[PDB]
Design a protein around this ligand. Structure first.
Ligand SMILES: Nc1ncnc2c1ncn2[C@@H]1O[C@H](COP(=O)(O)O)[C@@H](O)[C@H]1O
Ligand SMILES: Nc1ncnc2c1ncn2[C@@H]1O[C@H](COP(=O)(O)O)[C@@H](O)[C@H]1O
Ligand SMILES: [Cl-]
Ligand SMILES: [Cl-]
Ligand SMILES: [Cl-]
Lengths: 360, 360
């Protein structure tokens, strides 16, 4: 029986992808309403409630996680008791912006100019050895700053410590590469994906990344291989980069299945969810070859009219079962066509059904 | 919340196709082990246990079924309280071989020669207007008869009443057409698929039916549409035919998703399970266009080595969660590639993992 820290939609989808393989699941989440509960055994409890933690761990074959901000303490507490994939280290690295950048910077992968900022002297200490405008964000929320003074004003009423200074980067687009490494050591890579954000929320994902170079792919995969092996990664790893020209600058890493990959459920030969499961289980990884072209559109804080989205062919609706609320991810729609024209035509139909969707 | 009579694997896959649509499920089944119980709330009770039957229906939005032989009594007993799709009549027709052939004969669809037999005088009465060899099947098991006396030497120890005489048919192959009709009245048709049985159990399904002509397909659909409209059918209907030449004879019908359609989970734009749900929900039906080519091989009373099947590309494993037992359907594997050559290469490698399959 697989145990999953986090009862969100990512966990809900891991379970749905696992039942066909005859697997079992148990989730842990502090909210009785976790949508994964509608699909498997859900244990309600705080991650730092040792009692709930150990109760949930009983009989488990292994433990993995879907909630990216899960307390690393809860993951390490169970690490001794049962197998845990990905390794707790990955959470550590991914949960601290500075620790994240240094790690990749140390692997030899490009990253925006960044500098640690704990004191006003640090802010200046690197405010120029970085640039301007730029971003100042908590290492563990964030604020873009243009004015040389708006910066020293930024740290104020933001914390004043434990922050990171990143040099704003004018990117052509944002892309991400979902990669996977089995318990056996085998690896696999999905086509790059173009992600579009708006209001600080992923709104649309285009796969494969439109135009993506053939060398661009190998480039991303290369960086990904380095990261996974460096961490003894097992499962699915999501790497987000900024694309400037033909360069890739590491932006963020998530030790788990990622939103920018939901299109793999029908748009790839093997979903990221099934592969994550195959990986942590020590089974042969499945093919990541794409099935035509996909457009992943998130459903944020609103419930589109089902009959209307289902009228579009190639459109695959996914409602998470969560209660609708402002800015909340309540589902997504994957449009899988076999020609960019058709794809672009269906996307037109769906854009009229979803708000705040930045597409033309 | 959709309620399903029967907790078998068909119900289990129905629920899996539904969660992505934000649906809920409740199953009713005599066995506490119903594999559907692993994916939804399962009420353990006999279909003729009125107490359990009504307890099960509490609050359901509608009720459908997967148990091929659910007592039609239980289906009609709820038809009053809530919507029931497909209509109970389809269950009556499907459960009586004579009523089945009689029905389709009336629609004008070809059927092997058949004659009712409830006594020695009837056997002869039709045993001549049919011709040996032939099959003497019980209307509700069966026996192939060659000898003029092996016939009379069959009705006994087989009943003697409520049997039907069918004229043995030398078919090129067997094929089935899955059709769907929603409340709205809209309809859809999957590609005909080629089914190969052995030991009286479906062993392999090839989709789309190899070589099937555009005319054959159109005819099969014509019959299907007549049957569906004649029954005010709502949901997925599975029609099995015998292909002899360029014509096909109706052999059997099942008012539900069918085994010969499991390849549609990944081999068609919309699975038979999602379309069945879309139909009974009054939602726009989904495209039935095939995604390349598929081969559906059943897993009978044996658990293949998972690592071994996942080794082959394009292979999709589906373990039902049932306890392995002789003759029991415990899972299946859908292999879908985009070229007949590749398709045959895979089948070759899988055919070494599964016993009793008539391959090549
Ligand atoms: N260094 C950067 N330069 C420009 N935009 C950025 C930078 N870092 C983050 N963003 C934007 O902020 C959003 C991501 O927020 P976050 O996930 O906390 O990094 C995306 O919409 C990015 O376009
Ligand atoms: N009229 C028929 N002529 C030849 N074979 C038949 C006939 N009816 C049924 N069968 C065979 O019996 C099996 C179907 O069993 P059943 O579904 O109970 O009719 C299949 O493997 C068929 O090949
Ligand atoms: Cl949730
Ligand atoms: Cl079962
Ligand atoms: Cl499905």
């Amino acid at each position: 029986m697989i145990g999953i820290l986090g009862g969100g939609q990512l966990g809900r989808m891991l379970a749905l992808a696992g039942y066909p393989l005859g697997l079992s699941f148990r989730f842990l989440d502090p909210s009785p309403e976790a949508c994964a509960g509608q699909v498997g055994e859900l244990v309600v409890g705080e991650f730092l409630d040792e009692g709930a933690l150990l109760r949930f761990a009983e009989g488990l074959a292994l433990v993995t996680y879907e909630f990216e901000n899960v307390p690393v303490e809860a993951a390490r507490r169970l690490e001794g008791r049962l197998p845990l994939y990905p390794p707790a280290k990955a959470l550590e690295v991914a949960q601290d912006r500075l620790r994240e950048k240094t790690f990749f910077q140390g692997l030899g992968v490009p990253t925006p100019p960044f500098h640690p900022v704990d004191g006003p002297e640090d802010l200046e200490e690197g405010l120029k050895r970085v640039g301007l405008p730029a971003l100042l964000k908590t290492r563990r929320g964030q604020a873009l700053v243009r004015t040389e003074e708006e910066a020293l004003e930024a740290l104020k009423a933001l914390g004043g410590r434990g922050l990171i200074l990143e040099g704003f980067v004018p990117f052509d687009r944002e892309v991400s590469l979902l990669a996977v490494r089995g318990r056996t050591g085998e690896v696999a890579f999905y086509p790059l994906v173009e992600n579009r954000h708006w209001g600080g929320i992923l709104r649309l994902s285009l796969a494969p990344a439109p135009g993506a170079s053939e060398a661009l792919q190998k480039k991303a995969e290369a960086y990904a291989l380095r990261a996974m092996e460096a961490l003894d990664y097992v499962g699915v790893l999501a790497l987000e980069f900024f694309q400037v020209g033909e360069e890739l600058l590491f932006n963020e890493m998530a030790p788990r299945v990622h939103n920018s990959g939901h299109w793999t459920i029908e748009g790839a030969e093997t979903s990221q969810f099934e592969n994550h499961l195959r990986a942590v289980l020590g089974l042969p990884l499945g093919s990541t070859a794409p099935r035509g072209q996909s457009a992943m559109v998130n459903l944020i804080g609103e419930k589109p009219p089902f009959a209307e989205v289902l009228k579009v062919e190639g459109a695959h609706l996914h409602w998470y079962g969560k209660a609708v609320r402002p800015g909340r991810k309540v589902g997504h729609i994957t449009l899988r066509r076999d020609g960019l024209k058709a794809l672009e035509e269906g996307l037109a139909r769906l854009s009229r059904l979803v708000s705040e969707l930045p597409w033309e």
